[PDB]
Ligand binder design. Structure first.
Ligand SMILES: CCNC(=O)c1cc2c(-c3cc(OCCN4CCCC4)c(Cl)cc3Cl)nc(N)nc2s1
Length: 213
């Protein structure tokens, strides 16, 4: 059951700008997504202070990076508060019009792409390294859904009947560009995490697949 929706024009504009920029420090995308994951974890932790039962859907609080070399996909999963179906339509491709507009003005004046997070739209930095993204999300008291975009003007939201269950949280599935496959490598991922994400309150877990020999 696939619903199609249109991006707020300014958000479409930003995605095209980012997916085409030739910027040289693309590794900062990972800091931005980890930062979004930390913030989502802050929110479920806030609710859990009043109501500890909110954690029961996924009791471990974590950020997990899962390279899928077979698929040329990098996944970033958290057990944060997550997003309902309405959130996915709204937060993504509607809200943040204001931040996208200001960021684009700053870019024209010379701003570093790396200050995207200061306008609240660092999520879209993923298009530095990916040409296609799926956002899978599960909020307490709603079903699991998949939001999907290819940096054009349309996105879809679907009940998720094909991915592992998240329990609670969000998983971004980045379909990496052919020149950015370095971010599937354990050594590269560790470098970037250690450089740019030292002060994160939650464990950052790296899933690595090794042959037994
Ligand atoms: C509905 C309550 N939960 C949320 O809004 C969440 C938003 C996210 C996000 C997120 C945040 C995002 O925005 C960051 C916050 N800014 C948005 C507007 C100003 C602040 C964007 Cl544009 C996209 C996404 Cl997928 N990422 C992740 N990993 N988890 C959550 S949970």
């Amino acid at each position: 059951k696939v619903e199609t929706h249109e991006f707020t024009a300014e958000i479409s504009q930003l995605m095209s700008l980012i997916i085409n920029t030739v910027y040289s420090n693309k590794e900062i995308f990972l800091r931005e997504l980890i930062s979004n994951a930390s913030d989502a974890l802050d929110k479920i932790r806030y609710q859990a202070l009043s109501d500890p039962s909110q954690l029961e859907s996924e009791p471990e609080l974590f950020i997990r990076i899962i390279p899928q070399k077979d698929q040329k996909v990098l996944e970033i999963r958290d057990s944060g508060i997550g997003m309902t179906k309405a959130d996915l339509v709204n937060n993504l491709g509607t809200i943040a019009k204001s931040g996208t507009k200001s960021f684009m003005e700053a870019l024209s004046a010379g701003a570093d792409v790396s200050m995207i997070g200061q306008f609240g739209v660092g999520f879209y930095s993923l298009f530095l390294v990916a040409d296609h993204v799926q956002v899978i999300s599960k909020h307490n008291d709603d079903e699991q859904y998949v939001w999907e975009s290819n940096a054009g003007g349309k996105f879809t939201v679907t009940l998720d009947e094909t991915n592992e269950r998240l329990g609670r949280g969000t998983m971004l599935r980045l379909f990496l560009k052919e020149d950015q496959l370095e971010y599937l490598e354990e050594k590269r991922i560790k470098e970037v995490v250690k450089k740019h994400s030292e002060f994160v309150a939650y464990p950052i877990q790296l899933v690595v697949t090794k042959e037994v020999e």
